[PDB]
Amino acid sequence: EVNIVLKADVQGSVEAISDSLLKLSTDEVKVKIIGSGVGGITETDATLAAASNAILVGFNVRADASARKVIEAESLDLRYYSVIYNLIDEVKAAMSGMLSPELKQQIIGLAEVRDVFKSPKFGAIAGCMVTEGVVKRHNPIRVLRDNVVIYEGELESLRRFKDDVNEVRNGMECGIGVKNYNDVRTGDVIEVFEIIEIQRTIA
RNA sequence: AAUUGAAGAGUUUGAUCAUGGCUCAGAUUGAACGCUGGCGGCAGGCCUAACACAUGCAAGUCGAACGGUAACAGGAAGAAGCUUGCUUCUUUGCUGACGAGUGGCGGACGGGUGAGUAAUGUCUGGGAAACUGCCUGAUGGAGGGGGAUAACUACUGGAAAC
RNA sequence: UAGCUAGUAGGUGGGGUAACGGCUCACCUAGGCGACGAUCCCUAGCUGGUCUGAGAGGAUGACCAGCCACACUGGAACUGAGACACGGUCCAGACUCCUACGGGAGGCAGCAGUGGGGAAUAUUGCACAAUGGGCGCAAGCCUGAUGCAGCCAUGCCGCGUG
RNA sequence: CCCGCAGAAGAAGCACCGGCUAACUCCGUGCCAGCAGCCGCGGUAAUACGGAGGGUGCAAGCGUUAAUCGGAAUUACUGGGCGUAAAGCGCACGCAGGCGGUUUGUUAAGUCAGAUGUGAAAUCCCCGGGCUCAACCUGGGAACUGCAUCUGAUACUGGCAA
RNA sequence: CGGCCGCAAGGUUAAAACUCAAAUGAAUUGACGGGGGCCCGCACAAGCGGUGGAGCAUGUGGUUUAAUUCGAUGCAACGCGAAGAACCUUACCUGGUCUUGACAUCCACGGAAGUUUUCAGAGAUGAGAAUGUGCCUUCGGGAACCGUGAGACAGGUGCUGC
RNA sequence: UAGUCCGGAUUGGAGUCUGCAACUCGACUCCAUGAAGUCGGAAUCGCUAGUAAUCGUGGAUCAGAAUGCCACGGUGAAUACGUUCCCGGGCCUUGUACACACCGCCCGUCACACCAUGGGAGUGGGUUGCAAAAGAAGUAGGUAGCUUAACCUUCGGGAGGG
RNA sequence: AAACUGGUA
RNA sequence: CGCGGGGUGGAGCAGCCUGGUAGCUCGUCGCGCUCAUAACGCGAAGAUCGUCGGUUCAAAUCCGGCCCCCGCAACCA
RNA sequence: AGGACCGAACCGACUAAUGUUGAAAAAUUAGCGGAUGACUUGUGGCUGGGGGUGAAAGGCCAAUCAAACCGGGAGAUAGCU
RNA sequence: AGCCAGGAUGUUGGCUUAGAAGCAGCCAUCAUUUAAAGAAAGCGUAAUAGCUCACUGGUCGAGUCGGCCUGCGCGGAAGA
RNA sequence: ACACAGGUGGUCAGGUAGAGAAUACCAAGGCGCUUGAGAGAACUCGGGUGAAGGAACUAGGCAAAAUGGUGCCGUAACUUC
RNA sequence: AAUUCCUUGUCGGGUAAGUUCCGACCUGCACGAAUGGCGUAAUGAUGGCCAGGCUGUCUCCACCCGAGACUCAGUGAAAU
RNA sequence: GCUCAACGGAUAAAAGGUACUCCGGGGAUAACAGGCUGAUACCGCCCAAGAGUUCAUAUCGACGGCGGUGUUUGGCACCUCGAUGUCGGCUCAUCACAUCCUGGGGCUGAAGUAGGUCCCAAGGGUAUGGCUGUUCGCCAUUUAAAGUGGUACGCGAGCUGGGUUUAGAACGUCGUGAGACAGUUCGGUCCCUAUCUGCCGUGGGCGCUGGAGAACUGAGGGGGGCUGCUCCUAGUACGAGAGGACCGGAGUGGACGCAUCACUGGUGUUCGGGUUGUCAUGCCAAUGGCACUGCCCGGUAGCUAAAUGCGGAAGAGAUAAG
Ligand SMILES: [Mg+2]
Ligand SMILES: [Mg+2]
Ligand SMILES: [Mg+2]
Ligand SMILES: [Mg+2]
Ligand SMILES: [Mg+2]
Ligand SMILES: [Mg+2]
Ligand SMILES: [Mg+2]
Ligand SMILES: [Mg+2]
Ligand SMILES: [Mg+2]
Ligand SMILES: [Mg+2]
Ligand SMILES: [Mg+2]
Ligand SMILES: [Mg+2]
Ligand SMILES: [Mg+2]
Ligand SMILES: [Mg+2]
Ligand SMILES: [Mg+2]
Ligand SMILES: [Mg+2]
Ligand SMILES: [Mg+2]
Ligand SMILES: [Mg+2]
Ligand SMILES: [Mg+2]
Ligand SMILES: [Mg+2]
Ligand SMILES: [Mg+2]
Ligand SMILES: [Mg+2]
Ligand SMILES: [Mg+2]
Ligand SMILES: [Mg+2]
Ligand SMILES: [Mg+2]
Ligand SMILES: [Mg+2]
Ligand SMILES: [Mg+2]
Ligand SMILES: [Mg+2]
Ligand SMILES: [Mg+2]
Ligand SMILES: [Mg+2]
Ligand SMILES: [Mg+2]
Ligand SMILES: [Mg+2]
Ligand SMILES: [Mg+2]
Ligand SMILES: [Mg+2]
Ligand SMILES: [Mg+2]
Ligand SMILES: [Mg+2]
Ligand SMILES: [Mg+2]
Ligand SMILES: [Mg+2]
Ligand SMILES: [Mg+2]
Ligand SMILES: [Mg+2]
Ligand SMILES: [Mg+2]
Ligand SMILES: [Mg+2]
Ligand SMILES: [Mg+2]
Ligand SMILES: [Mg+2]
Ligand SMILES: [Mg+2]
Ligand SMILES: [Mg+2]
Ligand SMILES: [Mg+2]
Ligand SMILES: [Mg+2]
Ligand SMILES: [Mg+2]
Ligand SMILES: [Mg+2]
Ligand SMILES: [Mg+2]
Ligand SMILES: [Mg+2]
Ligand SMILES: [Mg+2]
Ligand SMILES: [Mg+2]
Ligand SMILES: [Mg+2]
Ligand SMILES: [Mg+2]
Ligand SMILES: [Mg+2]
Ligand SMILES: [Mg+2]
Ligand SMILES: [Mg+2]
Ligand SMILES: [Mg+2]
Ligand SMILES: [Mg+2]
Ligand SMILES: [Mg+2]
Ligand SMILES: [Mg+2]
Ligand SMILES: [Mg+2]
Ligand SMILES: [Mg+2]
Ligand SMILES: [Mg+2]
Ligand SMILES: [Mg+2]
Ligand SMILES: [Mg+2]
Ligand SMILES: [Mg+2]
Ligand SMILES: [Mg+2]
Ligand SMILES: [Mg+2]
Ligand SMILES: [Mg+2]
Ligand SMILES: [Mg+2]
Ligand SMILES: [Mg+2]
Ligand SMILES: [Mg+2]
Ligand SMILES: [Mg+2]
Ligand SMILES: [Mg+2]
Ligand SMILES: [Mg+2]
Ligand SMILES: [Mg+2]
Ligand SMILES: [Mg+2]
Ligand SMILES: [Mg+2]
Ligand SMILES: [Mg+2]
Ligand SMILES: [Mg+2]
Ligand SMILES: [Mg+2]
Ligand SMILES: [Mg+2]
Ligand SMILES: [Mg+2]
Ligand SMILES: [Mg+2]
Ligand SMILES: [Mg+2]
Ligand SMILES: [Mg+2]
Ligand SMILES: [Mg+2]
Ligand SMILES: [Mg+2]
Ligand SMILES: [Mg+2]
Ligand SMILES: [Mg+2]
Ligand SMILES: [Mg+2]
Ligand SMILES: [Mg+2]
Ligand SMILES: [Mg+2]
Ligand SMILES: [Mg+2]
Ligand SMILES: [Mg+2]
Ligand SMILES: [Mg+2]
Fold first, then answer.
1. Which nucleotides of C are covered by protein (CB under 7 A)?
2. Where does it localize (predicted)?
3. How far is it, in rounded angstroms, from Cα A23 to Cα A34?
4. Closest nt to residue A138, judged CA to C1'
5. Looking at residue A183, what DSSP letter applies?
6. Which nucleotide is nearest to A65 (CA to C1')?
7. Distance measured from the CA of protein residue A190 to the C1' of nucleotide M305, in angstroms
8. Cβ distance A102 to A198 under 8 Å?
9. What does the DSSP assignment read for A58-79?
10. Using the 8-state DSSP alphabet, how is residue A170 labeled?
């Protein structure tokens, strides 16, 4: 929800801008005008915009001293425009910004378990051979045993022989330590991936 | 004539008496809100932001203090196209008056507010070392001179204010 | 909140005010206030009165009347009998407005009225006919004081809805 | 303010009904929905919730909320308490402070008596008068319980002397 | 929290927000006590015979079933209601039937009651043939009883033993 | 002196009998088979005299049904020293924070939710003490600079003002 | 010798 | 190829110089005790001695193989 | 009074620059610490090497110290260059 | 292979359609009329239309089309 | 090792200013340091000044710059007072 | 944390931006009580961080004063 | 009679530390750098299921395949152990193009503006800070852009010394201990006068055919080449609107470079003045020396930046992609 507190100089302007803003309401995100009025921005308008995280917009009006008191004390998003199209552009920008970042995954590593070992803190650690890609320190992982998901989490411990490492490229041996992954069995595959964003926008 | 003045109840316990709190019945208000609403008389009406203000009005008056004709309500002279003796038009302060100016009185009253002030203010009761426009009583003067300035004219700076 | 005060308390002389006075200076003394509450901190205009109560007391100071303080904020003085002056002056400050960008103006806590705040509180009205003030010999002019009217069941009282 | 025409025509609502507290039945619901100042009602026969009928109270008003006093002798001066309900310091010595045996004299401070002055008006109260009654307005009185000065009393308290 | 005191532990002075309708003292009656005293019962002790072990009868719980009808549940339910479930009893299950009805009562019409057999069908049940057509009888009918029809009704071993 | 001439369940075959009806689901009889069971754990029950123990007979319900219920008789014991205790009950007294009356009441940590509150490195404001800098306007004091219509003058200038 | 506890209204 | 002890029922356990009916603690299913629960008591199911080969009426106790666990060595991923 | 304070002589050596075939085999310039004390200094004496001394750094013992210097075993040995 | 012509619609198939008869989209995945035509491959038209592909008629006229095996070349080919 | 910017104990110690044996200029006294003369370039060393900005420099305010005396007034948290 | 690998752990403060610093959290790889634990006024040519002043440290160097460097005369090295 | 099992059997009889170290050797053997290689990494290409509403190839692209570079992580041990100084920073650079900006084009799922992808192009240009030793990285805030790599991971006989491999000390951890950690923490000597090559400047000799003084031509070489914003065209083309051009002109900036002191300033120990202490010129007065030019205030010329003038071009020829 995008909350708007709209005050304009003329009632015709108020009633035109309200419907112009309502027309562009998308299913994913909507816009509500909690307050709509004619005249300068008042302390009541400031309080109403403080209650809900609203954008306090004045079409051809300016805040008085009393309203500016609350505006200074609590920092709200006060906006002054002179063109309905500028106001609509800003509202569309806010609506688009409110959207989700579109989390997506892609495989960047692959290892096969061999020669299970033991550890005091993490319990049973897996001695993996990286077959393709790269495996990083703290990235989400998926354990597959015969192409069926067994474990979902994040790679916690990654060292070689004796030294902790941040990454291991394909072709080297590595040790993977996940305390909750206690059913370590030879032949298991581990997929490593990261998270990518596309940052959708309304259109 | 002016002193005709004083009520209790519910609630702790199985029940009782105490102690002790809470609650209610009364009166009152610069009240607000809900439902409803015919008339009249008297009174009251920003208690919060001593927060900010568009616009109009709320302190003027004296020509019987004095220079004056900027309005113009009269009159007279004169010059004139003449209604043919009655009109008109420039001077003229004689004039009923009077914009602007000097001068006198008033603007310290009336009106508004409760910020500040814990006594440097207020209430009560006293005092001595004081002034007092206008209003009133009494006793006495009110003689003779001088130099300026506003207004008004001639220039000049100004968008305005000046 | 237990200690507070150096012009501080007293005296001589000068100065100053309408008037007494550390009111102000020079000098001399070390004094003065405080447990009967000094100093410090919080709150608040005071009274006649109003409410309540049998009374004593408790709460309160809205209207009317008396006194005090203030006039956008801070400061100063002039004029005047009387001001350290609500609709005066000068300086400084915050804010607002006009500008030809050279430069200027402003003070509703006066009566109406507007924005804002709030649960909440009215007409941008008529007249100087009466009373009372300012000027004037008077006539007369001015007077949002005042007299009236408009809005509100806000209160008290009276009548009707047969 | 008086007169004339017509016509019951234009004019009644709010709260409450278990006890406190004046006023009872039915239906719906079934610890749900709801009520509630206090005690507290509602878990299938509710005088306590919702509706209807009936009744009680007030009336151009009625009810709710806010605030003060009263009831509250529940800050007890009038007018309370501390063995066990709250409440005697663990005990003692002692400054300031409070109180103090008996005889006389004196003072006259406390105390009491009389007089004078004062205690604004309005408001409160008593007797009257005017708005068609009332509210309201208004004449006189009383009160304004206080404060100051003067003149006296000397029982008691205080001071001085013995 | 602040102040003072103490090496420390801590001591002394001493609140507010918030929450409840109570908290509390003395005493009365009852109950209870791993308090005391006295007394009684096949209560214990001293004995006999048992149950709990095995087979069987019966009831109950549980389970299953179309139904396994409904009750009764520590002592004080469990050979209990039940002093007699193969039909009935018997409500419960599945099927087949009826709607003023199996039973009471009001009304109309028709028909003696009853005794004999036959078709279909598990039966109930429908569907025929028979036989019979008597007492009172005011000669339009009643009383004993049968069939059909309408409406008031009849009916419930359905729930609440709080 | 044994799983037996004890023990009788189960089971097969064959029969008697009530009743419309013995298969779900009756009683009795004849032949055959002959399980478990050789005195029974924790625990628990009745009985003090014709009692217990054991042995037969009858009745109700009922067409047909008992090891159940009710009822009659034959044979016929052991042990009770005593109230020290389990259970229950009665009376007197005592303690109680109990009164849905000990199957009462009631405490604290810990897990969850909400409300207010203390400490807290810091952050943002208001007021104010002390020590300094700062000096608009105004008032007062002092003035070799400039300027000046009222008074004086020797007419050159003085006094005084700005 | 030991001898706990008792949902709410 | 790495230093010792082991392996009894669902879990933990007794039989060692003593090779003779598989027993005891805790768990599961019952019964009793109590108004009821806990506690407590009485009972039942439950087994190649970790797994095989020599020895032997016999079974880790006399031995020899296989498998598993643990004291450390067990690297350390 | 003080293993008190500031600060010269005096005793040190924290920073920087220079120098690094130096003026010097550790110094110069500018700063810096202590400066009545566990202080500093002159003269003389004692402790001798698997030993001494050490408010401890494996520090010092004549420009040399995880075992001083001089002479000898000695032409030690060197699977090494 | 060019050029001169046909090269269409039985039938807006149902439907959509700015104005869709093959071409902006679905079902339909068939067949006559026919020298010759697929209810159609596409530019194009505010859909047809205009203009085109397959097939065939005429003019022109002798070569033309696509595979296989082979020799030598071309691109793929950026570094201090 | 040098006619070496180093080290070396004691005694005397004047004037002006100054607390002073610090520091500055002088007296008595002693010295100009055993290669010079020119020029007035990069670069190095030792110094002075610097518009506006003022740590942005750097591992780091290194180095520089800055403060600096006597008298009087005044002075916080904390504290073993 | 003079102790924490993961690690620039998370939150708050400071900045404009803070792997450093200060205050907390506790998941203490791998604190801990005379190999002392936790505090602590004063002290320190001790380690870390911040602020005022100050500045050629720096943006970005410029000019000037002396000693060398350069030229002339005398003497006259060194590593390799 | 020996698990002399290290099994041709050094003793009957035997473990460690050295960062306090020392000697003799080795590039017969590692760490830095070079060399070979190219598994890995980076870049390119082949096929095309599929995504893209329809549509493989606007943009991506599964399962698979083929190459280039020398460029990361690796392999080898060929050079250097009678010495090739190692990370980061400063100063100074130079090359490649697989192009970050600027320039020219094709395609687009390119209406305009703004974008995506590919081709040609190396002339010029290509950030300051906060934190960390930090190259990198995150963050703040700019720019037209804040390019990727080679050069002994360019550059210590140019500088630094923060990290890191000496000696001191401590924490955690391991060890009985000496001690150790590729864990942390505080402190800790950076030498060289340039012979040759090279480079930046400046001279002498001879030659060029009689000698000498001048002015030239120009084979050849070097320097330079960057770019923002505002206005007009024009609120026009394009679009429903919002918004908003190509092409072509003008003006004013940033960085960089050259020149020059007319101006604004710095310096100006060679000019004038003020002033503290002290000494001297016989003394007063007036002067001089010393104390950083004693301290300080101004300031001529010259040199200078912060000051003010100019520059990068237009044009022509032959071309790359097209
Ligand atoms: Mg007027
Ligand atoms: Mg006039
Ligand atoms: Mg007044
Ligand atoms: Mg005097
Ligand atoms: Mg006085
Ligand atoms: Mg009372
Ligand atoms: Mg009061
Ligand atoms: Mg005056
Ligand atoms: Mg006035
Ligand atoms: Mg006004
Ligand atoms: Mg007003
Ligand atoms: Mg409002
Ligand atoms: Mg009334
Ligand atoms: Mg009643
Ligand atoms: Mg009901
Ligand atoms: Mg009272
Ligand atoms: Mg009391
Ligand atoms: Mg006592
Ligand atoms: Mg006493
Ligand atoms: Mg007495
Ligand atoms: Mg008296
Ligand atoms: Mg009357
Ligand atoms: Mg009266
Ligand atoms: Mg009065
Ligand atoms: Mg007396
Ligand atoms: Mg305290
Ligand atoms: Mg008996
Ligand atoms: Mg017994
Ligand atoms: Mg039995
Ligand atoms: Mg029932
Ligand atoms: Mg039953
Ligand atoms: Mg039941
Ligand atoms: Mg039946
Ligand atoms: Mg009952
Ligand atoms: Mg038999
Ligand atoms: Mg037997
Ligand atoms: Mg029978
Ligand atoms: Mg009895
Ligand atoms: Mg209990
Ligand atoms: Mg707090
Ligand atoms: Mg002044
Ligand atoms: Mg419990
Ligand atoms: Mg000392
Ligand atoms: Mg010192
Ligand atoms: Mg040192
Ligand atoms: Mg020195
Ligand atoms: Mg010291
Ligand atoms: Mg050591
Ligand atoms: Mg030595
Ligand atoms: Mg030795
Ligand atoms: Mg020998
Ligand atoms: Mg030899
Ligand atoms: Mg050898
Ligand atoms: Mg080829
Ligand atoms: Mg010499
Ligand atoms: Mg010497
Ligand atoms: Mg000496
Ligand atoms: Mg020089
Ligand atoms: Mg220099
Ligand atoms: Mg300097
Ligand atoms: Mg100078
Ligand atoms: Mg500067
Ligand atoms: Mg400056
Ligand atoms: Mg500064
Ligand atoms: Mg930097
Ligand atoms: Mg320094
Ligand atoms: Mg300095
Ligand atoms: Mg770390
Ligand atoms: Mg900083
Ligand atoms: Mg910290
Ligand atoms: Mg430790
Ligand atoms: Mg210990
Ligand atoms: Mg030389
Ligand atoms: Mg020479
Ligand atoms: Mg030589
Ligand atoms: Mg061998
Ligand atoms: Mg060490
Ligand atoms: Mg060696
Ligand atoms: Mg080699
Ligand atoms: Mg190498
Ligand atoms: Mg390599
Ligand atoms: Mg080899
Ligand atoms: Mg090499
Ligand atoms: Mg060599
Ligand atoms: Mg290219
Ligand atoms: Mg060119
Ligand atoms: Mg390098
Ligand atoms: Mg490089
Ligand atoms: Mg080099
Ligand atoms: Mg380097
Ligand atoms: Mg270092
Ligand atoms: Mg070039
Ligand atoms: Mg010049
Ligand atoms: Mg100058
Ligand atoms: Mg000079
Ligand atoms: Mg002199
Ligand atoms: Mg001299
Ligand atoms: Mg000298
Ligand atoms: Mg060109």
1. 115-118
2. Cytoplasm
3. 16
4. L6
5. -
6. B52
7. 68
8. yes
9. ESS----HHHHHHHHHS--EEE
10. T
Whole-number distance in Å between A188 CA and C136 C1': 121
∠ CA A179-A184-A189, nearest 5°, is: 110
Q: Reported resolution in A? A: 2.6
Cα A87 to averaged position of ligand 92 atoms, centre (Å): 56
Q: Which string of DSSP letters, residue by residue, matches A94-149?
A: HHHHTS----EEEEEEEEEEES---BTTTBS-EEEEEEEEEEESS-EEEEESSSSE
CA–centroid distance, A198 to ligand 73, in Å, is: 74
Round to whole Å and give the CA distance between A154 and A15.
53
H or E segment and range at residue A200: none
CA of A180 to the centre of ligand 85 (A): 53
Cβ atoms A11, A62 nearer than 8 A = no
Name the nucleotide with the smallest C1'–CA separation from A64: C116
Tokens of A151: 């474990």
